[PDB]
Amino acid sequence: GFHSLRYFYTAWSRPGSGEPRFVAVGYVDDTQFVRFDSDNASPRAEPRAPWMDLVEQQDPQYWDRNTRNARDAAQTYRVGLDNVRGYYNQSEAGSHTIQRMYGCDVGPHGRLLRGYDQLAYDGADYIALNEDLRSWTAADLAAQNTRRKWEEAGYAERDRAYLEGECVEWLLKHLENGRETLLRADPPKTHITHHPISDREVTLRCWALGFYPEEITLTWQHDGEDQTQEMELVETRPDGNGAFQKWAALVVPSGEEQRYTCHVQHEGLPQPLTLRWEP
């Protein structure tokens, strides 16, 4: 079992009617804790989770450091959008997008399991740091322009020094300082709904509300046979208060409800749950 510190940048151009916008968000596991948006007046990095309200006392330079970092990042991806547009020989008329996702997965004893740093252009793979943290994979010919530059500058080493050092150390700081928010596993509150459609056909919907972390499995079974191919399974959605919701539904013959069981697996439960419908 591991925890993650992940950052997500998006930069995108407004060709005519604006300079590019740049947004950055950081997550520990499924919890957002920081943001930056270049559109604000004098834009600053800002806290988004409660323990981040105490970082200023624990690290008095944190906000200034990271604000300066984010503002340099916005400036270089604004040039980066023009460089890449030229690699693809694209015109200046249309809008384009650069995305970056980087961070570390860390197992129990502060042990790095994986580092990553990936970029996308207009929503497709552009260049990624390889698992060995010493080489880059370029997605196409245009991206080779970038790989060659980053190889000659030796950026992989700087990325690897961050992912093995700062990324791991700061995950641990946020995990400890944010223990109340981060190191919990709230189990879902579950129940089954019943809304018939015809005289002899019924929908059974298995709900799971307020759980954290986001990972969860809901399964419907008939007489112990799995109904995965037949179920309607909605995408997990945020409830707005830092937790998540999900349901799974199955259409079933009327009068035959009690032969269907909903299986629920979540980290916050002692044991997976089976669930029947009951009047």
Partner: peptide
């Protein structure tokens, strides 16, 4: 902290 950012 944020990492460094490299120019594509």
């Amino acid at each position: 902290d944020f990492a460094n950012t490299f120019l594509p």
